[PDB]
Design a protein around this motif. Structure first.
Motif, PDB file in Angstrom:
ATOM      1  N   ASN A  83       0.798  -1.434  -0.064  1.00 18.65           N
ATOM      2  CA  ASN A  83       0.199  -0.270  -0.231  1.00 18.65           C
ATOM      3  C   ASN A  83       0.818   1.273   0.262  1.00 18.65           C
ATOM      4  OD1 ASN A  83      -3.419  -1.557   0.788  1.00 18.65           O
ATOM      5  ND2 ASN A  83      -1.387  -1.952   2.148  1.00 18.65           N
ATOM      6  N   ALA A  84       0.261   2.421  -0.593  1.00 18.94           N
ATOM      7  CA  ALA A  84       1.259   3.344  -1.055  1.00 18.94           C
ATOM      8  C   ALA A  84       0.895   4.757   0.904  1.00 18.94           C
ATOM      9  CB  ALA A  84       0.238   4.528  -1.498  1.00 18.94           C
ATOM     10  N   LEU A  85       1.602   4.270   1.580  1.00 18.28           N
ATOM     11  CA  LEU A  85       1.983   4.715   3.062  1.00 18.28           C
ATOM     12  C   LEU A  85       2.313   6.510   3.519  1.00 18.28           C
ATOM     13  CD1 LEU A  85       4.573   1.756   4.037  1.00 18.28           C
ATOM     14  CD2 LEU A  85       1.778   1.734   3.902  1.00 18.28           C
ATOM     15  N   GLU A  86       1.838   7.334   4.737  1.00 23.89           N
ATOM     16  CA  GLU A  86       2.009   7.612   4.663  1.00 23.89           C
ATOM     17  C   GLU A  86       2.314   7.964   6.207  1.00 23.89           C
ATOM     18  OE1 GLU A  86      -2.617   8.891   3.824  1.00 23.89           O
ATOM     19  OE2 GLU A  86      -1.973  11.161   3.377  1.00 23.89           O
ATOM     20  N   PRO A  87       3.124   9.201   6.795  1.00 26.83           N
ATOM     21  CA  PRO A  87       3.410   9.299   7.802  1.00 26.83           C
ATOM     22  C   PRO A  87       2.590   8.830   8.876  1.00 26.83           C
ATOM     23  CG  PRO A  87       4.206  11.120   6.545  1.00 26.83           C
ATOM     24  CD  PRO A  87       3.540  10.043   6.022  1.00 26.83           C
ATOM     25  N   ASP A  88       2.426   8.231  10.115  1.00 29.34           N
ATOM     26  CA  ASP A  88       1.876   7.745  11.003  1.00 29.34           C
ATOM     27  C   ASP A  88       2.207   8.643  11.997  1.00 29.34           C
ATOM     28  OD1 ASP A  88       3.864   6.427  11.723  1.00 29.34           O
ATOM     29  OD2 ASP A  88       2.637   5.159  12.346  1.00 29.34           O
ATOM     30  N   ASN A  89       2.942   9.097  12.825  1.00 29.46           N
ATOM     31  CA  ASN A  89       3.440   9.672  13.443  1.00 29.46           C
ATOM     32  C   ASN A  89       3.753  11.346  12.888  1.00 29.46           C
ATOM     33  OD1 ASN A  89       3.682   9.831  16.370  1.00 29.46           O
ATOM     34  ND2 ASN A  89       5.270  11.074  16.235  1.00 29.46           N
ATOM     35  N   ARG A  90       3.551  12.165  14.160  1.00 34.38           N
ATOM     36  CA  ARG A  90       3.993  13.712  13.962  1.00 34.38           C
ATOM     37  C   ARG A  90       4.281  14.396  14.648  1.00 34.38           C
ATOM     38  NH1 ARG A  90       1.030  16.621   9.391  1.00 34.38           N
ATOM     39  NH2 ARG A  90       1.550  18.753   9.934  1.00 34.38           N
ATOM     40  N   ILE A  91       5.524  15.050  15.300  1.00 42.71           N
ATOM     41  CA  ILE A  91       6.208  15.553  16.290  1.00 42.71           C
ATOM     42  C   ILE A  91       6.295  17.350  15.749  1.00 42.71           C
ATOM     43  CG2 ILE A  91       7.557  16.112  17.958  1.00 42.71           C
ATOM     44  CD1 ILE A  91       8.153  12.710  17.707  1.00 42.71           C
ATOM     45  N   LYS A  92       5.572  18.565  16.317  1.00 41.50           N
ATOM     46  CA  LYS A  92       5.156  19.593  15.661  1.00 41.50           C
ATOM     47  C   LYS A  92       6.515  20.088  17.571  1.00 41.50           C
ATOM     48  CE  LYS A  92       4.032  23.104  13.865  1.00 41.50           C
ATOM     49  NZ  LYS A  92       4.974  23.943  13.925  1.00 41.50           N
ATOM     50  N   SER A  93       7.673  21.283  15.934  1.00 44.34           N
ATOM     51  CA  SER A  93       8.125  21.513  17.420  1.00 44.34           C
ATOM     52  C   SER A  93       8.866  23.206  17.056  1.00 44.34           C
ATOM     53  CB  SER A  93       9.767  21.099  17.154  1.00 44.34           C
ATOM     54  OG  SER A  93      10.341  21.078  15.172  1.00 44.34           O
ATOM     55  N   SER A 150       0.659 -10.114  -9.118  1.00 40.34           N
ATOM     56  CA  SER A 150       0.500  -8.249  -8.807  1.00 40.34           C
ATOM     57  C   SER A 150       0.429  -8.195  -6.903  1.00 40.34           C
ATOM     58  CB  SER A 150      -0.919  -8.083  -9.365  1.00 40.34           C
ATOM     59  OG  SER A 150      -0.119  -6.304  -8.991  1.00 40.34           O
ATOM     60  N   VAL A 151       1.792  -7.537  -6.367  1.00 42.32           N
ATOM     61  CA  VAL A 151       1.545  -7.231  -5.070  1.00 42.32           C
ATOM     62  C   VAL A 151       1.342  -5.678  -4.721  1.00 42.32           C
ATOM     63  CG1 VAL A 151       3.106  -9.022  -4.710  1.00 42.32           C
ATOM     64  CG2 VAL A 151       3.999  -7.282  -5.232  1.00 42.32           C
ATOM     65  N   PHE A 152       0.950  -4.384  -6.285  1.00 45.13           N
ATOM     66  CA  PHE A 152       0.711  -3.458  -6.154  1.00 45.13           C
ATOM     67  C   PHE A 152      -0.052  -3.416  -7.514  1.00 45.13           C
ATOM     68  CE2 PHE A 152       0.941   0.669  -6.262  1.00 45.13           C
ATOM     69  CZ  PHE A 152       0.238   1.595  -5.675  1.00 45.13           C
ATOM     70  N   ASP A 153      -1.089  -2.249  -7.666  1.00 49.52           N
ATOM     71  CA  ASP A 153      -1.043  -1.640  -8.728  1.00 49.52           C
ATOM     72  C   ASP A 153      -2.289  -0.599  -8.604  1.00 49.52           C
ATOM     73  OD1 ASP A 153      -2.270  -1.183 -11.265  1.00 49.52           O
ATOM     74  OD2 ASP A 153      -3.354  -3.057 -11.439  1.00 49.52           O
ATOM     75  N   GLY A 154      -1.740   0.477  -8.625  1.00 49.57           N
ATOM     76  CA  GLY A 154      -2.816   1.402  -8.108  1.00 49.57           C
ATOM     77  C   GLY A 154      -1.904   2.492  -8.080  1.00 49.57           C
ATOM     78  N   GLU A 155      -2.204   3.908  -7.716  1.00 50.56           N
ATOM     79  CA  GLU A 155      -1.975   5.080  -7.625  1.00 50.56           C
ATOM     80  C   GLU A 155      -0.814   5.192  -6.618  1.00 50.56           C
ATOM     81  OE1 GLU A 155      -4.375   8.430  -8.104  1.00 50.56           O
ATOM     82  OE2 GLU A 155      -5.273   7.733  -9.836  1.00 50.56           O
ATOM     83  N   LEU A 156       0.168   6.454  -6.700  1.00 51.54           N
ATOM     84  CA  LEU A 156       1.496   6.562  -6.038  1.00 51.54           C
ATOM     85  C   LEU A 156       1.933   8.049  -6.509  1.00 51.54           C
ATOM     86  CD1 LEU A 156       3.446   5.901  -3.314  1.00 51.54           C
ATOM     87  CD2 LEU A 156       5.071   6.258  -5.133  1.00 51.54           C
ATOM     88  N   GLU A 157       1.273   8.868  -4.962  1.00 49.98           N
ATOM     89  CA  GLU A 157       0.609  10.204  -5.109  1.00 49.98           C
ATOM     90  C   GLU A 157       1.729  10.705  -4.594  1.00 49.98           C
ATOM     91  OE1 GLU A 157      -2.996  10.779  -2.650  1.00 49.98           O
ATOM     92  OE2 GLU A 157      -2.813  12.611  -3.006  1.00 49.98           O
ATOM     93  N   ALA A 158       2.543  12.502  -4.691  1.00 47.73           N
ATOM     94  CA  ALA A 158       3.210  12.750  -4.182  1.00 47.73           C
ATOM     95  C   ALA A 158       3.094  12.932  -2.145  1.00 47.73           C
ATOM     96  CB  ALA A 158       3.040  14.657  -4.290  1.00 47.73           C
ATOM     97  N   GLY A 159       4.004  12.803  -1.634  1.00 44.78           N
ATOM     98  CA  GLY A 159       3.779  12.523  -0.287  1.00 44.78           C
ATOM     99  C   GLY A 159       3.502  11.273  -0.036  1.00 44.78           C
ATOM    100  N   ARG A 160       4.167  10.561  -0.579  1.00 46.53           N
ATOM    101  CA  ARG A 160       3.670   8.517  -0.019  1.00 46.53           C
ATOM    102  C   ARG A 160       5.310   8.294  -0.280  1.00 46.53           C
ATOM    103  NH1 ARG A 160      -2.786   8.059   0.174  1.00 46.53           N
ATOM    104  NH2 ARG A 160      -3.419  10.165  -0.100  1.00 46.53           N
ATOM    105  N   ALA A 161       4.969   6.414   0.408  1.00 43.04           N
ATOM    106  CA  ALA A 161       6.575   5.733  -0.147  1.00 43.04           C
ATOM    107  C   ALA A 161       5.964   4.861  -0.521  1.00 43.04           C
ATOM    108  CB  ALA A 161       7.280   6.106   1.064  1.00 43.04           C
ATOM    109  N   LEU A 162       6.481   4.217  -1.083  1.00 39.12           N
ATOM    110  CA  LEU A 162       6.096   2.012  -1.703  1.00 39.12           C
ATOM    111  C   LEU A 162       7.069   1.815  -1.947  1.00 39.12           C
ATOM    112  CD1 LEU A 162       3.837   0.233  -2.890  1.00 39.12           C
ATOM    113  CD2 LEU A 162       4.102   1.700  -4.765  1.00 39.12           C
ATOM    114  N   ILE A 163       7.457   0.645  -0.664  1.00 42.44           N
ATOM    115  CA  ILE A 163       8.792  -0.252  -0.993  1.00 42.44           C
ATOM    116  C   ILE A 163       9.059  -1.168  -2.253  1.00 42.44           C
ATOM    117  CG2 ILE A 163       9.680  -2.564  -0.080  1.00 42.44           C
ATOM    118  CD1 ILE A 163       8.868   0.714   1.793  1.00 42.44           C
TER     119      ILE A 163
END
Lengths: 379, 381, 381
Positions: free
Chosen positions: B9-19, B294-307
């Motif tokens: 799956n196309a991944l987003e960050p799951d944690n945000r640390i504001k400083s 097929s282990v992935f078929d879909g969109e990868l959009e700016a800001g996301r990671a895929l291995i």
């Protein structure tokens, strides 16, 4: 996770194996510190005219001679006997070496090693086994493969006792009596890994295969870093001893005067096994959360693991605190956090000021109030 | 078995640390994709006149400057301050470097690193941590050793390095009063100031209007690409053949840009895992494993990671004017095998071997080889 | 602890997969011996005019040609087709090689490999996969990435690489009609055709009546041995000193032949695990561990494998006119320590060290050293 260590302890050996000619002490390799470091540590004591019988290990070793003098021999495959004595010969063997207090000995993986104390003083040898080396293609259990004797593992029988006698007789063209001795059938089980040799030993020695495998890093050697009122440091690396490039191991010897300090520092690229040799010192070790994982004394004879990147600092509580640090890298690099040309001194002053919310003049004091690099004299 | 992956799956960050001065976002390192790759991924945003405070890490890193401009400094052991200004000195430090959008920065294991945003635009930096590197002699948990501040770890799933030491020791070692040591230890700081801090007046450092070896290289649009088709796109990889420091880190990076409806032929990495991070636009990606699934078929959009695991085949089609990405790879000399195209792996087989393998007519095998003349990038239609 | 083995067994394959043109047999990679060694073993049999269809693997391999003759092709990324035939060409492909009985073939990680039996005799090829190589950045499950066919992995514990991609994508990328893509993907193919397929008319490829580096070497009876005694046998090892590609694979192989009732002395591998595969005849082998215990005492016969762990001592006696074997070793420079014999490790110790260690008379130690004059191979009686 083996290295999420919240508290460390100065460690002693937890097992003692007495043999007729000496003593072998082992630290528990399953203790959390040694599993984090990925090594095993042992200490052998050889009484006068005693012989550590030949063995090979499935991992690289560094041996530090804490005390005494004697002879060692490493026996290599594919190497001829270069020591020869007439009378077809009266005696013949591969090169043998003298060792003395302060020597580091590099034993490559799988190489046969033996050691003999020829003097009236006991030899004490501390050996570090890098069981997590990529040259260890078995598992993390430290193993000794003994060519002689009939005793158990340090952490039994010798390598020949598992073979058929009739096979060994044919291969060697010797009678049954010799093969039985070879296999150690009649041997008392208490004779052990270190044996007595009554008359002493006569070997060929003066009054690639021959490459240098030992170097003295003790007080008698010329140090890398020296302050006559703080102490000294001397490291053996693959830049000094090329065999270490193969073992991926190095060692650091240091001596610290009473109330002298070395600044906080960390190893960029190695775990360190700190073994105190003389006196005591108060050590402070800090992890990634900024928590003290050790604050206390390390006294002669005990071991302490300094994990990679953990910061450490020390203050000697004795006339001379001295130690040997085995490191899991043939080129271990030290990062000094404070002092002249330290990592803080290498940052722009206004970067220091902003990072710590300091006045400009306070940042300059942080850099330049103490002029010393690594060793700090008392007070 | 960490890499027996059936579904990605196309991944987003799951944690945000504001400083105080910015934002740090982390992807979950225990997610199955990142454990297969053996890495961790984080994204840092530096507001104008904000400072990423010095830290060192127990593994090699590559940092890609997604956006913005500023200064960075790596502080090495055994290196003298080569930047000097009079008035013993008014200021003194190790070499500092300007960074710009499209730069890859190599941070060797254990080396102290800091970064400063010098402009009115936010800096966005995406950093890859190779926690399974052999140079990491600890464990797979990514760690930061902070030299300043009083905050938690980026990957807590606190305090600075000096706060664990006794003050009387630091006073003697430094020969400074207790007030300087308390600041050194970050006693003067709420835990919420964090890793990125504001610097009100801006920052004055020495900079023009082995220790000094080059550790960064631009692989973005402004650079000269390795592979280019003006109607399909471009690729530019930084390897240890370009940047010798990468030989020590065992890491490389690939920048690519793909025109709308342009394609990448199916290809695989012989000798590396890839962490694909989209920079701009989106694309439809297809990844297939050893079972031909097929282990992935879909969109990868700016800001996301895929291995993309080693040896898994992958292909892409851009859905935007420009789809662009950066692929971090766990090898300083990552090699790509092209399955189709000119001089591809199929074209390297004898035609009658191709025919027999696929039960094709001779003329069908030739069409498979030579109907499309392009190597790696395929223009639309 | 994977290598605390209290007994070893002569192993046979535990799975067989029949295909149109041959047979592939696999040893269980989860057997405790292979987990200690960290490798997988398979044996492929190619009938006359049969083709092992192209595949690549996520780990380095050594292939020993137990029997037969034919052609193989390794297809590299970034390499041009150096074989060319006019009439814009009739055929074109990368370099192809003849293989014969006794050849070791080195297949680097991720490189496509195919093999063809060109003769009236079946080809038997034994391949060793070093799944624990650090070049394998996935996991220890051995994987095959097949470019053709519609069958399952040989290690069942399917489809080809192209069948995981969408059909419309492949059509656009290749600029080819739908019929050719369906063949490429193998949708029509019966699942039992398999990895080795028949080729009816035989096959014409370009062949005489860096990319081109040498990747195979014969270590069999026809080659010049490293060690030879006309009344005992011979040994020939291929290392990175003979075949530089092995420097990258970190693999080597040893071929040996032992005359009836001849022996080789007890010895151990300093720096490698060995996978002993018997090629001809039978021998009685003895393997002892660090406790001095026999972990194996029995016969190893042609067609079976036996793991010799690093540092475990081993000795052998042939029970046949010729016992011969190939030993794959997990090190490009595997070193042998001979415990007994001329210039052995015992002969390298001072005589009085030998005497004291074994409590022998001086004359008994000399007999231990010098009663037998041979180094490694010992003739009968």
């Amino acid at each position: 996770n083996e290295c999420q260590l919240e508290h460390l302890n100065a460690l002693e050996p937890d097992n003692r194996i007495k043999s007729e000619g000496g003593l072998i002490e082992t630290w528990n390799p399953s203790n959390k510190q040694f599993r984090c470091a990925g090594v095993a540590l042992s200490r052998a004591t050889l009484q006068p005219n005693s012989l550590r019988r030949p063995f090979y290990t499935n991992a690289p070793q560094e041996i530090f001679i804490q005390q005494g003098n004697g002879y060692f021999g490493m026996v290599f495959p594919g190497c001829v006997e270069t020591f020869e004595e007439p009378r077809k010969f009266r005696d013949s063997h591969q090169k043998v070496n003298r060792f003395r207090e302060g020597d580091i000995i590099a034993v490559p993986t799988g190489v046969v090693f033996w050691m003999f104390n020829d003097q009236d003083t006991p030899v004490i040898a501390v050996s570090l086994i890098d069981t997590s080396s990529f040259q260890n293609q078995l598992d993390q259990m430290p193993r000794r493969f003994y060519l002689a004797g009939n005793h158990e593992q340090e952490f039994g029988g010798n390598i020949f006792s598992g073979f058929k006698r009739d096979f060994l007789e044919d291969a060697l063209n010797v009678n049954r009596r010799i093969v039985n001795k070879l296999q150690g059938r009649n041997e008392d089980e208490e004779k052990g890994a270190i044996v007595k040799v009554k008359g002493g030993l006569s070997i060929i020695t003066p009054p690639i295969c021959t490459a240098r495998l030992h170097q003295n890093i003790g007080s008698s050697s010329s140090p890398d870093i020296y302050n006559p009122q703080a102490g000294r440091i001397k490291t053996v690396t693959s830049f000094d001893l090329p065999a270490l490039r193969f073992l991926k191991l190095s060692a650091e010897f240091g001596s610290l005067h009473k109330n002298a300090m070395f600044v906080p520092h960390y190893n960029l690229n190695a775990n360190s096994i700190l073994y105190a040799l003389k006196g005591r010192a108060r050590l402070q070790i800090v992890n990634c959360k900024g928590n003290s994982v050790f604050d206390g004394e390390l006294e002669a004879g005990r071991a302490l693991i300094v994990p990679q990147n953990f910061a450490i600092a020390a203050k000697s509580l004795s006339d001379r605190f001295s130690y040997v640090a085995f490191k899991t890298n043939d080129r271990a690099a030290i990062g000094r956090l404070l002092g002249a040309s330290s990592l803080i001194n290498g940052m722009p002053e206004e970067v220091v000021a902003a990072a710590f919310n300091m006045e400009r003049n306070e940042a300059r004091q942080l850099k330049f109030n103490s002029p010393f690099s690594f060793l700090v004299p008392p007070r």
